[PDB]
Structure 1
Amino acid sequence: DGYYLESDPCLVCNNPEVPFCYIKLSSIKVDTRYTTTQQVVKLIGSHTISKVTVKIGDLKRTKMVRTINLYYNNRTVQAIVELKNKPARWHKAKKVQLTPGQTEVKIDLPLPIVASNLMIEFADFYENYQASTETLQCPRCSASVPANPGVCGNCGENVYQCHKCRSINYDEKDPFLCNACGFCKYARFDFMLYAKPCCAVDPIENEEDRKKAVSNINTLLDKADRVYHQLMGHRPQLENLLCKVNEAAPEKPQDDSGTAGGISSTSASVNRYILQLAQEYCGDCKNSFDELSKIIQKVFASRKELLEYDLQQREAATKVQPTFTASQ
């Protein structure tokens, strides 16, 4: 399909129109932490997200979500816990209101967001008040338990423990989410992100990030140099395979003792030089070129972010044209 052995890969032929897709959030989460109202997630990589769909199952009428806030950022972090209690590091994408008992929410974003982390907050509720004064029943031995302190006098079981992970919240006896495992007794939540796997770099703030960003760019450029050598290293071998096939010699299929490789009769029939060329170019050259193109796109994003930061600093240091689309 593509010409895998190309210097300075064209930003047109190589870069495709990545399509948005109904990706399950569960399939791209690599780390997750919770508060009593928030699910904070690290994604496998940066994604451009246009829509978020929330499906709500097993809904209980005693406490129903009224408000969902969606937050994001594009910060590279080792673990999502670094962002869990850092509200100033999050950008608000959307607030949505739900009707009582609503089981599906579509969050259309006015502009696509670029995010490596998401935070979904259940910010308000249509809580239905009940008589909590009544002695609770012990989940282990069915004895009556006073709501305060909520410890069974017969077996010592705490009635406010999370049904899933047995953790106890000290500050909130009836949290919407378990802050340890995210369990919700009031509903089940599934998230479907209409997004795409478009990798991007974190924004730059101060020289700390500017020097850091430049170091990252240099490292990625060194990586591209290395993958460049691998891709062009196959070139000579590919030329050799080409010359050998051009000879068009009738090399009868050789019955190699090693049959571990899955070689079909038809494939064995296909010229080995032809097969060696197909493996070298479509396999090895294509893998190396894909790696190099990914590195080149990430380097371009880092350069573009660096360029924008420098322009902002100069724009402020200095203290244009209608056809400004020509610039930037």
Structure 2
Amino acid sequence: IKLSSIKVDTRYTTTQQVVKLIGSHTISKVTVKIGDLKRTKMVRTINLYYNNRTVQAIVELKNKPARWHKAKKVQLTPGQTEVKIDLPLPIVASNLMIEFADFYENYQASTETLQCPRCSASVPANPGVCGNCGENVYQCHKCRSINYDEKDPFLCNACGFCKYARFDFMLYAKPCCAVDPIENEEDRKKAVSNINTLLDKADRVYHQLMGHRPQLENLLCKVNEAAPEKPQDDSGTAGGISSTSASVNRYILQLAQEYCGDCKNSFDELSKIIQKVFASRKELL
């Protein structure tokens, strides 16, 4: 799974990409591909962190290191363009943090006056503001934000832009319904309330499976009669029904829609709710 396809929220520090996933996933491996590599600053160390906390927005976890579990540390050679992170045990995660923790930084003569990206005038490295047009030479090339604390950050803390490389993440994972770990009675109460709400939802959908029950019971009766009702050419033609399919017994088509469509959708929803309830019960127990 491409990490980009399952991210719903992302925040950055100068060294970290912090991501909320669309849902909890069981992850066995992480692959990092590195493109457009610049030799001036290359990643030496990647740390992978995770947690399974339900959050509304990932910003709630951005500067909260004590809320993250370290899955793996990996070392890179200079100019390495692919990293395979095999986890010794699969992790269950609704959030990930990828940290570029150390670098093979190649030192250069920053003393030389920088060139203005707008007007090409010479700009002193301190303060890094063009005396001709007022442009800041340390602005992010992508989003124009300026970092006050770090003039040359590895990542833009506003948009995650990196001038030193491009990073693609491929997660060998699978969607897995799960809940946040229970800590103290505060979380115990939260889990119990969540269980009660999910049980109410499960009761509602049960009724849907059972709501289609009499309908299927009835359509099956009609189909068993095997009556040759002559083809009914209804004026409404919104549905793309081919002559052969239109000539199929209406009750047969009605049965196929009711069971394979409606009953299957309701049963899938109920099974998802039942699995999530089982996970919550297991965590509470």
Which TM-score applies when normalising by structure 1?
0.87
Shift of 1:46: 0.1
SS in 2 for 1:45: strand
Distance in 2, Cα, partners of 1:212 & 1:114: 20
CA offsets per residue over residues 139-191 of structure 1, 9 Å max, x none? 00000000000000000000000000000000000000000000000000000
CA offsets per residue over residues 99-118 of structure 1, 9 Å max, x none? 00000000000000000000
| Equivalent position of 1:152 in the other structure | 130
Distance in 2, Cα, partners of 1:82 & 1:73: 13
| Equivalent position of 1:42 in the other structure | 20
SS in 1 for 2:139: coil
Identity %: 100
Distance in 2, Cα, partners of 1:91 & 1:113: 10
SS in 1 for 2:79: coil
Number of residue pairs the alignment of both structures matches:
285
Distance in 2, Cα, partners of 1:215 & 1:189: 40
Shift of 1:263: 1.0
Query: Which of residues 283, 301, 305 in structure 1 aligns to 2:279?
Result: 301
Shift of 1:261: 1.1
SS in 2 for 1:48: strand
Q: Structure 2 regions of 5+ residues with no counterpart?
A: none
Shift of 1:266: 1.7
Distance in 1, Cα, partners of 2:54 & 2:103: 32
Which TM-score applies when normalising by structure 2?
1.00
SS in 1 for 2:257: helix
Distance in 1, Cα, partners of 2:231 & 2:122: 82
Distance in 2, Cα, partners of 1:296 & 1:264: 39
Deviation above 2 Å: which 4+ runs of structure 1? none
| Equivalent position of 1:258 in the other structure | 236
| Equivalent position of 1:137 in the other structure | 115
Distance in 1, Cα, partners of 2:234 & 2:73: 65
Q: Structure 1 regions of 5+ residues with no counterpart?
A: 1-22, 308-328
Query: Which of residues 257, 267, 272 in structure 2 aligns to 1:279?
Result: 257
Shift of 1:252: 1.5
Shift of 1:233: 0.6
CA offsets per residue over residues 177-235 of structure 1, 9 Å max, x none? 00000000000000000000111011000000001100000000000000000111100
Distance in 2, Cα, partners of 1:266 & 1:148: 78
1:211 paired with 2:189, answer: yes
After superposition, the CA RMSD in angstroms is 0.3
Distance in 2, Cα, partners of 1:284 & 1:73: 36
